[PDB]
Design a protein around this nucleic acid. Structure first.
Lengths: 102, 80, 34, 105, 93, 94, 107, 34, 78, 97
DNA sequence: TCGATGTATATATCTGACTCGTGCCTGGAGACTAGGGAGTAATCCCCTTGGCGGTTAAAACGCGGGGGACAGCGCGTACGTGCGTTTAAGCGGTGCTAGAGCTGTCTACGACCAATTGAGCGGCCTCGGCACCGGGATTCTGA
DNA sequence: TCAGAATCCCGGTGCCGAGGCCGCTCAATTGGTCGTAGACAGCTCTAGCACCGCTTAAACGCACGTACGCGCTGTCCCCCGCGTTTTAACCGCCAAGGGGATTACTCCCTAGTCTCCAGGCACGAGTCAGATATATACATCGA
């Protein structure tokens, strides 16, 4: 039968996903996570969330994650590797810390 | 099923693909979930503080905008 | 290690490994870890 | 008769509204006459540059309506304009398509 | 309801002026609104700080020019000062 | 003679003689204290002004300063700052 | 008229309150300012100053020196979990760096 | 590419490599390479 | 006179940074980085002192330029 | 005779220069460089620098360079080398910029 | 080097929001007082020369060698990839109510201001932490 | 383990910077108007949350394969560590005037207001890109 080589399918995914602008995380689970975190922070008070606020939060989180993964893969390529590794994320967050953390 | 597991492996893979990542290790997902959790914690705490100062019992999309702007990442398209 | 106020001062934590100081609505600090 | 201060200087952006924002924005005790017109001119020039780049990007895409994707493509492809908006994220803007040469076989 | 003032007519006018046969959708138009507001906030804040540093209580035409010099980079700054000077010169007449 | 320049040197010294009575302070350290106090004051006042403006008000009350403190200080510092400020304002009211 | 008592004396604070109130009005932060805002801000400033000075004095005493110097200030500030974050983007004149040699290089 | 204003729009340059634009009191840009 | 920053000085700065082994090409890169940083800071300071109609650049202008750039500086300023 | 093994003098230098807090760049060359840059920028108009103006600039430059070198060496040790290479500085400037 | 197997672009073909249009308020255009800048002016101080010069502590050049480190070859495992389930997201319509959002309206509150007077600046000045002067020590490396 | 040699401790000296002291002078406290900002009630109506049915994408297993990362050549080369010569930074120093920085002054430009009016804002009406079916040059593994 037919079977693509390992890697030539991920390139198509990269090209497809750098072209579109739709959100990548499922909407409902992200809203549930946001509600849980807000409830845990506010200690039992039920706060209502607008429809637009969840969307804005999801957009910001997705952009931040994409940029962080870009920097992590930059580090991985610097280390003479093509695989993203957990230490790469830690190094990327360390190089742009308290100034860029917030 | 814990909520933080709602961000599944395919979602992180798609985010990495948008980020240019070609190959992904099996231990990336937990670290990414932790980073997302801490970012959400910070932003949501700031937004809830902004809302509570306004004597409101529901948070709006504008309060998230001020929270993100204060944290350092200005956001465009939601009023300011 | 304590101060006059009483906060537990320690050497700075390693935020990059997930360690953080959680703060709630009542400002009660919960020390977190990676 | 009535003559708008925006039309005197040939400015599309308003001058009275900018002056009101400067006065009511608790920026300073007093504001001069030329500050609102200078601000309006600078804002109009920046908006015009953004719109030129966005329109060229939209034309290159075989469209006639400007969208966040076009604004993101135009803003991040100009150096003098990317630096000004370096710390700004644009909703539904995507990313600039690039793949590092090492990955390409 | 309540009036919600925004830079709508002006943005559409500039788009008409510079690209005669195109339009802007709602989301991109709100993005442009936010961009204009952000730039105005930056310039006004820098001008206020410049006025306070020298112990002055007036935002003259000079202060905005120096704020534009400080914030905008390179050619953008040069063209912005040129256009602003042209505009104030035209207004004075 | 010369023009008077205001600084927090005397007050920083007064606070110094309350926690370490036998310890002095240099001049560069005094300048650093002045700069730090001015920076923190500017941060708090700016955040209070922004919070007042976002709510369509024209008054910086103690609530705005309290929220700015809650926003600008991490954790235990924020908690102790709110506690001490509330105690001071309560003592002032009487 | 009777005797005059300073607002710092009334509130039991060492930092000035009239000076902070004047700086709030003259700084163009808002059209009007309340009456408890300067007291609150002065209390916060005094707490922060006391914390910094106490840590600096402890660091100076650990060095058998009875005078606080910018090196002592840097040592006090950079060894705190929260105070480091509050002053993360700040460079202190004549402060040096924390002694930190990582374990990989050590033979 | 040129704008209607007349300035030359250029793609972003590798600032980390030292490439930089020179400004002056005349605000005349000068592309400088690293 | 960018050669005024001597080779041992870069070694001393690296040693204060916990650096144990230095390549031979590091010095030119460090000189370039110092040059660009100085260019930016001096540009902002010169603009600040020009606005005040002054002819001697004071320490306050340098402090304000550094604060605007992102790195606050304590000490100097009185 | 006596000759220390390579490397064991670097650690002593590191400790010696980390314990103390003085400036690590000679005053006159740095002042001349700053004056040259200012003269080139202003294009022919002489500018006078205050006594404290040069000191603050030198302090800021030294602190920035030290922190950047720390980040670059961290990048190298991630890259599994004990030597600070030029590409490490470029990566450090790219990631935090 | 070609067959063809998935395929993601081009080719034609029906449909809901952006740009029209118009009420209609609510926010923009003009004379005139009064404090904030512009221009002026003697004064002193600190900054840059233009030099003094000398001294001594870095800086530069050179040589020997020891350890990084880069290229390269081997093993094994794990993360990529295609195919058969099942599980929770997405869409649409109901509905109920919590809660934003606009209006009325006074009341406590902060701006404004003459008048004192004492806290907080500036200039002086001794003396004691502190840096510097000189004299014995534990840790690294060849034998 | 023994032998150089750099470092820290220890005591004695001279110094200049830092705590008080005195004098003085602006600005903060006391005390009292006077507009008005917003805190409190009241009402409308509008989005937000919970639910019910129906239609479809992640999860878990299974077989290659190629990325990588210690281990040994290997080797080689280049960056320390030390010695010897060079040089220029820096510390006291005369000086002197350009420009900051006074005071310190004296004389001319925007804010608030009342009168008038038009230009953006909100509320209805009409299609271009979104989606649906071919189709079709891409390109890419395996012989």
């Amino acid at each position: 039968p037919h079977r693509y080589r390992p890697g030539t399918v991920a390139l198509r995914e990269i090209r497809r996903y750098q072209k579109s602008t739709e959100l990548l995380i499922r909407r409902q689970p992200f809203a549930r996570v946001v509600r849980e975190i807000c409830l845990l922070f506010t200690r039992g008070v039920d706060y209502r969330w607008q429809a637009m606020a969840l969307l804005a939060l999801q957009e910001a989180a997705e952009a931040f994650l994409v940029h962080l993964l870009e920097d992590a893969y930059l580090c991985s390529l610097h280390a003479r590797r093509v695989t993203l590794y957990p230490k790469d994320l830690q190094l990327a967050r360390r190089l742009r810390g308290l100034q860029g953390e917030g | 099923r814990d909520n933080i597991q709602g961000i599944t492996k395919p979602a992180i893979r798609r985010l990495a693909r948008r980020g240019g990542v070609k190959r992904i290790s099996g231990l990336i997902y937990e670290e990414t979930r932790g980073v997302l959790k801490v970012f959400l914690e910070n932003v949501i705490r700031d937004a809830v503080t902004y809302t509570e100062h306004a004597k409101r019992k529901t948070v709006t999309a504008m309060d998230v905008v001020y929270a993100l702007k204060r944290q350092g990442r200005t956001l465009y398209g939601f009023g300011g | 290690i304590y101060t006059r106020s009483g906060r537990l001062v320690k050497p700075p934590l390693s935020f990059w490994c997930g360690e953080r100081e959680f703060v709630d609505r009542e400002l009660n600090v919960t020390i977190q870890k990676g | 008769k009535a003559k708008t201060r925006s039309s005197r200087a040939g400015l599309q952006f308003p001058v009275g509204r900018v002056h009101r924002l400067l006065r009511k924005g608790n920026y300073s005790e007093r504001v001069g006459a030329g500050a609102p017109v200078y601000l309006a001119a600078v804002l109009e020039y920046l908006t015009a540059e953004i719109l030129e780049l966005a329109g060229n990007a939209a034309r290159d895409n075989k469209k006639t309506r400007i969208i966040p994707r076009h604004l993101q493509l135009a803003i991040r492809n100009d150096e003098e304009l990317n630096k000004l908006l370096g710390r700004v994220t644009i909703a539904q803007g995507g990313v600039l398509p690039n793949i590092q040469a090492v990955l390409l076989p | 309801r309540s009036r919600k003032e925004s830079y709508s007519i002006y943005v559409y006018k500039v788009l008409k002026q510079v690209h005669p046969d195109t339009g802007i959708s709602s989301k991109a138009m709100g993005i442009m609104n936010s961009f204009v507001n952000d730039i105005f906030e930056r310039i006004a804040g820098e001008a206020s700080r410049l006025a306070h540093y020298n112990k002055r209580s007036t935002i003259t035409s000079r202060e905005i020019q120096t704020a534009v010099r400080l914030l905008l980079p390179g050619e953008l700054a040069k063209h912005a000062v040129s256009e602003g000077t042209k505009a104030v010169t035209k207004y004075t007449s």
